[PDB]
Ligand binder design. Sequence first.
Ligand SMILES: NS(=O)(=O)c1nnc(NC(=O)[C@]23C[C@H]4C[C@H](C[C@H](C4)C2)C3)s1
Ligand SMILES: [Zn+2]
Length: 257
Amino acid sequence: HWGYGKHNGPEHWHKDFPIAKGERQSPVDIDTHTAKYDPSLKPLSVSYDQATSLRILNNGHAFNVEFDDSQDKAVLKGGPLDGTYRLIQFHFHWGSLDGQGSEHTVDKKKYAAELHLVHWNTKYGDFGKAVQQPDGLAVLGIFLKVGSAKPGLQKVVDVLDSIKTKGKSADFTNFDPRGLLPESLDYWTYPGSLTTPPLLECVTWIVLKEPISVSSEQVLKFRKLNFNGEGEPEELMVDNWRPAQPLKNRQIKASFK
Ligand SMILES: NS(=O)(=O)c1nnc(NC(=O)[C@]23C[C@H]4C[C@H](C[C@H](C4)C2)C3)s1
Ligand SMILES: [Zn+2]
């Protein structure tokens, strides 16, 4: 089944998931000179003060930190969004090398990794219904570069030893996702898709202009994870990113100049 290897990687996904060649696929290259400033875009509202993290899980393609999304505890609104979107999970995509790993690119530049905070539109009642709607999800994307350590990421890094292999989970309570945000909330936005199968076209992408910096040691610990389950041959979880897809009939908008 699908993955990031030579025989099941992004170039193969379209066989099981024909929408891979669809009209609003993600990620994309963000051409900063062609992105249109949109003065009517509202400031993002990130309200994570009441966030309740529950668990961290190695799902065989990345690790997800999951949140309680049965009430409005951590929500995203404003920006290009109408209504309220609840945080359900975050995860990362990263490379085998610092020069690659992000899914979105900026003027063709790849970052070392990319964080996705996934939210769903509460008007649809649950995440399963939301992914079937064109405005069902809002994903906040944040680039990572290697430099100084990100203090707020360290609790994540330190639990990875306990979820090395596919299917492993660990209690992960009281984690504050605010510690992963850059200083500025300036963003680009466009309509797109999930970047992993089923590749559903249900996402309003909000990609922050300002990367966070993480340390060499922090990203190295990401790369010690495994795609495989325990007792299966070891394959390091690296390069779990989908490359840029055709923009087609879409305009990327900027919240800033
Ligand atoms: N890379 S990306 O952000 O476009 C995404 N690509 N796929 C995502 N899938 C989900 O978010 C899931 C959310 C919760 C329910 C479903 C099962 C777990 C827990 C995963 C799907 S995000
Ligand atoms: Zn993702």
